[PDB]
């Protein structure tokens, strides 16, 4: 039979519905949450753009095949261990954001197992100070 398009449909569906969940989640935010989320997009894009080269050199150390999943996290979380400043959080988030952008053929889960749990907890710690740093 004609099967040579089966994997294309699989890939596009997973992308499609994932984008639809995201839209469903954004829709259930109030305007304040939307304005904060908008600020996070723009902040990280600024940092990713102005530190394009710096991130590429950091991305190469993390990209090689040797690292375990915890080893990536422990490298990223090291900055947050001693330095809990909100800007350090924002840079960390922007770097995580850049890694996600380059892993568009890897599994989404592979990216989420870097961010979620420990790392996002440490960013959310004193979230009020983080939000205030971002919203001005």
């Amino acid at each position: 039979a004609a099967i040579e398009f089966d994997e294309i449909v699989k890939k596009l569906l997973n992308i499609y519905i994932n984008d639809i969940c995201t839209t469903g989640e954004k829709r259930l935010l109030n305007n304040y949450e939307k304005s904060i989320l908008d600020r996070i997009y723009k902040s990280c894009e600024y940092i990713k753009k102005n530190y394009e080269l710096d991130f590429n050199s950091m991305y190469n150390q993390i990209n090689i095949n040797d690292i375990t999943t915890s080893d990536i996290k422990s490298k990223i979380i090291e900055a947050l261990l001693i330095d809990s400043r909100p800007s350090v959080k924002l840079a960390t988030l922007s770097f995580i954001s850049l890694i996600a952008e380059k892993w568009g053929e890897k599994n989404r889960a592979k990216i989420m197992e870097i961010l979620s749990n420990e790392i996002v907890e440490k960013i959310s710690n004193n979230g009020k100070d983080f939000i205030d740093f971002i919203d001005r």
């Binding site: 940092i47 530190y51 710096d54 950091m58 150390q61 993390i62 490298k75 990223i76 090291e78 900055a79 261990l81 001693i82 330095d83 400043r85 800007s87 350090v88 924002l90 840079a91 960390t92 922007s94 770097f95 740093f133 001005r136």
Partner: peptide, 18 residues
């Protein structure tokens, strides 16, 4: 702590900016 050493560096430089 090489990646960490740069995240703070970017953090400092952006801290001054905003």
């Amino acid at each position: 702590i090489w990646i960490a050493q740069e995240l703070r560096r970017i953090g400092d430089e952006f801290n001054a900016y905003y």
